[PDB]
Nucleic acid binder design. Structure first.
Ligand SMILES: [Zn+2]
Lengths: 177, 71, 114, 24, 130, 148, 108, 46
RNA sequence: AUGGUGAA
RNA sequence: GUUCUUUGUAAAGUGCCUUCGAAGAGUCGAGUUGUUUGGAUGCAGCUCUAAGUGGGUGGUUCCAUCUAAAGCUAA
RNA sequence: GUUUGACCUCAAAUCAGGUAGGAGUACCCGCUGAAUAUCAAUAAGCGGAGGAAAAGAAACCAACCGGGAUUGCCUUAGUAACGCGAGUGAAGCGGCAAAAGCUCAAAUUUGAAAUCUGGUACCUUCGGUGCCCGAGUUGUAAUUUGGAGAGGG
């Protein structure tokens, strides 16, 4: 498949061809609003491996965030606030420069009957998935939360506040031990 | 200094600031704070008529059925 | 006392309107006096209006019979959260691979004694 | 995989050398 | 709470639900044989022992075949399409039992079925018809 | 002034040879949805031994699958694909595989001949007419590869 | 400060849940057959204990497949390897006994 | 030499099974009387 | 210290 | 249990022989600056930026265990 | 062609079918956050969900004759470790409660975009069918998710 070629080409990020593409695309986006609807992703391989599919129900948005609450987290929060009726699934980096960093976020509309009847995507329609970025359930949010296995995440394996509450509580049984 | 507020009528609508210190009018959110435990109780749900919330529990008990009795 | 709804069910729209007008005239005449009959006529007016509304609603339902996207007024009043929470068909939707796996190896019933 | 190696070589020839690689 | 007091004072009335007794009682709903022999007076473990079945496969924590015969007795309680039959008959008439020759029939073996599949289908057809 | 891997586009097949290639490709237009549907309905009604169909290959993933197998004889590439990275490497892949390639201006024009609004690439594997295809390939080579 | 006044209530709820599972899962024993396991941490290696599920090699040696085994009530764990002949033989014998003792009703 | 693998499937040298499935589905629909053959549609065009 | 109130 | 349907050269599984046999990059990683931990880890602005019999985690020549940079899932 | 078409982009319609605010808030998730070590990832503030939430089937724990999703309890243990000062303070193994595995990216359906949204008329109406419209080729269905898996006999 061609997607392997796309991934390999994207591996050499500092190639003169990708440099030209990035500097052209950033200049083109500089003339557009901060957040706007994207007709199609500029990195089809990344979106496809992130779960995006070219079918009625998916939406691609490009958002610009000031350089220097991670930048990806801020972008996800902004797109979720603007796209209140859509659910943020994942996002990927698409460009950067000395002033701004650009990320592309793919959204799925749970109201569209195509998604509702999609056995592989109807899970997002559950109300528990509302505003995934708000609770940091996205890929970037989970990574920032330190959720992982091993000694490197013992203090933040699942919930930094939960462990503090557990170690601060006084468990007393009916018959004292 | 203050005047009747349309949303609440608490007579706390500042004339000069054009805002209500009690309910937060015209802000969409209703002003409330955790430290104001008594304030929250004074405006907590159930203090009013509850024209619609009252029947929700009864409707749920029947599974939100529709139609009419078969006699 | 008063009018009976079961008698008014079969009345036509024009007859119901005439009865409502007569009841309104009677109520207006009685108001000048200021008297339980006032309560009876008030209840009759409400019953006639309810019968007329019921007839109109069933007519509206009939004109929208079977076709998709009926007026929101006639739609279910269950709750906001139940219009979401995908319906039974959507929830039961399953991919072909999972159906094939289930058919090939369905959950069996068994007991362990011998 | 031979195909993966071929694709990697093709990408290497297409992308040329990176600015830091060009210093060599 | 304020809402509880309002509901108690309201004339709407509580939506009373009495189901405490129903938590203790559970009716078997996955077998007709067990239901006839199951006794709700005994516990799960006691009922399983009475029926002659194991309620636990691993060593249970803490201290501790007249019916199975019915279960064992309970254990003792595809064709070819018309177009497929016609296709099989055509090849059988054209080549008989010559499977190797039948395999190379370009204008009758539209689908390049293997010799094994062809012979199996022909044997099934013969058994069903002749 | 751009990197050599870029600007390989903007040099394209001339008007005459491009028109000849389009005329040749129009012969193998794939059966559109309506035509295929009606033909299948007719076949079902008749039922109620077959020659292999011939059509152009246009799917980018499908074309790339056919490319690098050396089955593709001539491939058309659109020069206005917004994700240019999807087609920057295709000419080099074709050159490495020895498959002649032709850059034709307009993805919309490329897609108009395959019943699609747009089509990034188009390739031919089978032929009805082999002499015409060989002559077109030779002309395209002599006019594009030996020049640019 | 949490006081476990519900201990009796929690036990009653667990018993009720088990009874409900039995009512829904009457024919089956509510448990999946588990393999024998030897623990690490030599302080406990002498103790043998039940595992999560049988290895693929053990299931194959038992004359059945993992997909079919799961539908019959056998826990399958593809993460555990095998490096002891005695444990493998014990697991195979346990699986054979389970297969010889299970009764499966017809799907018809 | 080509880089790929997975030698040619039989379906590439055999008529498509999807076409047969669609034809049989249309035949079933005709049997159920919910599809009119195009020849009958020509007559019904009157 | 946190969050608000009015006051030129 | 009861009743109508299946079908279509349709979809899977078992053992054997044969030909092939993909793997999440501004990502891992190092540097520095703020932050958390009783953990020295992790979190975070930014210069650079990794490989495929490769990469991560642990010790006396390396040996033990997985395949991150996507997501869903009742108890 | 001193023209006429394919798209792509951008606007509008009292367009048709949809969703978003807010309320409540004991529990859940994220951000922020006081009165160099201590009160402290507390108090207060903001944003986002449900009946539970989060997490969840390892780039895991271990150095053993090895265990094998996540979660809660006892134990480990007031130990290791640190600030060695007042003091903070884990985690594997072990026993218990309950156990369920899966879905995409990745190699051609190319002998048939086989996929799906919407409109229309019916029926057995949480949906199905005939037709049309549009999305899809810059990839919608099936086949594979490392336990390997795929074309054939
Ligand atoms: Zn007010």
């Amino acid at each position: 498949g061609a997607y392997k070629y796309l991934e390999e080409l994207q591996r050499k990020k500092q190639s003169d061809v990708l440099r030209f593409l990035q500097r052209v695309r950033v200049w083109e986006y500089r003339q557009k609003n901060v957040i706007h609807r994207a007709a199609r992703p500029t990195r089809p391989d990344k979106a496809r491996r992130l779960g995006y599919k070219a079918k009625q129900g998916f939406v691609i948005y490009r958002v610009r965030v000031r350089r220097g609450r991670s930048l990806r987290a801020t972008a996800e929060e902004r797109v979720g606030r603007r796209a209140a009726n859509l659910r943020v699934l994942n996002s990927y980096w698409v460009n950067q420069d000395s002033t701004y960093k650009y990320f592309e976020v793919i959204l799925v509309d749970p109201q569209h009957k195509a998604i509702r009847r999609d056995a592989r995507y109807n899970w997002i329609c559950d109300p528990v998935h509302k505003h995934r970025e708000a609770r940091g359930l996205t890929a970037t949010g989970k990574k920032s939360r330190g959720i992982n296995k091993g000694h490197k995440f013992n203090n933040t394996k699942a919930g930094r506040r939960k462990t503090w509450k557990r170690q601060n509580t006084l468990s007393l049984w009916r018959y004292r031990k | 200094s203050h005047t009747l507020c349309n949303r609440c009528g608490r007579r706390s609508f500042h004339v000069q600031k054009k805002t209500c210190s009690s309910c937060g009018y015209p802000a969409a959110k209703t002003r409330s704070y955790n430290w104001g435990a008594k304030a929250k109780r004074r405006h907590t749900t159930g203090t009013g008529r509850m024209r619609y919330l009252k029947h929700v529990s009864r409707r749920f008990k029947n599974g939100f059925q529709t139609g009419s009795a078969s006699k | 006392a008063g009018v009976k709804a079961y008698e008014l069910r079969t009345k036509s729209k024009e007859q119901l309107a005439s009865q409502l007008v007569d009841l309104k005239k009677e109520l207006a005449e009685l108001k000048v006096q200021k008297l339980p009959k006032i309560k009876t006529v008030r209840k009759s007016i409400a019953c006639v209006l309810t019968v007329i509304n019921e007839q109109q609603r069933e007519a509206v339902r009939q004109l929208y019979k079977g076709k998709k996207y009926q007026p929101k007024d006639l739609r279910a009043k269950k709750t906001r959260a139940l219009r979401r929470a995908l319906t039974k068909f959507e929830a039961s939707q399953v991919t072909e691979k999972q159906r094939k796996k289930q058919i090939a190896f369905p959950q069996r019933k068994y007991a362990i004694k011998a | 995989s031979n195909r993966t190696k071929f694709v990697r070589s093709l990408v290497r020839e297409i992308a040329g050398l990176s600015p830091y690689e060009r210093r060599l | 709470s304020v809402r509880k007091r309002k509901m108690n004072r309201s004339s709407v009335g509580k939506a009373t639900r009495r189901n405490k007794d129903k938590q203790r009682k559970i009716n078997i709903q996955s077998n007709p044989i067990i239901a006839a022999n199951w006794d709700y007076s005994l516990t799960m473990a006691q009922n399983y022992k009475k029926l002659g079945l194991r309620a636990k496969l691993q060593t249970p924590a803490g201290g501790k075949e007249t019916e199975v015969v019915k279960k064992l007795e309970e254990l003792a309680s595809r064709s070819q399409s018309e177009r497929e039959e016609e296709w099989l008959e055509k090849l059988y008439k054209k080549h008989g039992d010559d499977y190797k020759k039948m395999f190379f029939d370009k204008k009758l073996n539209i689908y390049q079925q293997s010799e094994g599949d062809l012979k199996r289908r022909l044997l099934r057809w013969k058994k069903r018809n002749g | 002034k751009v990197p050599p891997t870029i600007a390989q586009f903007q040099y394209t097949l001339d008007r005459n040879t491009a028109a000849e290639t389009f005329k040749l490709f129009n012969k193998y237009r794939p059966e559109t949805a309506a035509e295929k549907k009606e033909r299948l309905t007719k076949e079902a009604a008749a039922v109620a031994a077959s020659p292999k169909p011939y059509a152009v290959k246009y799917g980018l993933n499908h074309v790339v699958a056919l490319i690098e197998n050396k089955k593709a004889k001539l491939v058309l590439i659109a020069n206005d694909v917004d994700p240019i990275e999807l087609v920057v490497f295709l000419p080099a892949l074709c050159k490495k595989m020895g498959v002649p390639y032709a850059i034709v201006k307009g993805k919309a024009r490329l897609g108009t001949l395959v019943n699609q609004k747009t089509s990034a690439v188009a390739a031919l594997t089978e032929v009805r007419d082999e002499a015409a295809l060989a002559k077109l390939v030779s002309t395209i080579d002599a006019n594009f590869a030996d020049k640019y | 400060v949490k006081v476990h006044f519900d201990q009796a209530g929690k036990k009653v709820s667990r018993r009720n849940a088990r009874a409900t599972r039995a009512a829904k899962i009457a024919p089956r024993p509510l448990d999946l057959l588990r393999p024998v396991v030897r623990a690490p941490t030599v302080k406990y290696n002498r103790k043998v204990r039940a595992g999560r599920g049988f290895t693929l090699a053990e299931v194959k040696a038992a004359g059945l497949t993992a997909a079919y085994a799961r539908t019959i009530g056998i826990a399958v764990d593809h993460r555990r390897q095998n490096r002891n002949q005695e444990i493998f033989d014990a697991n195979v014998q346990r699986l054979k006994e389970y297969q010889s003792k299970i009764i499966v009703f017809p799907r018809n | 030499m080509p880089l790929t693998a997975v030698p040619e499937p039989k379906r590439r040298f055999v008529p498509s099974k999807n076409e047969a499935k669609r034809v049989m589905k249309i035949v079933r629909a005709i049997r159920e009387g919910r599809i009119i053959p195009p020849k009958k549609l020509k007559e019904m065009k009157e």
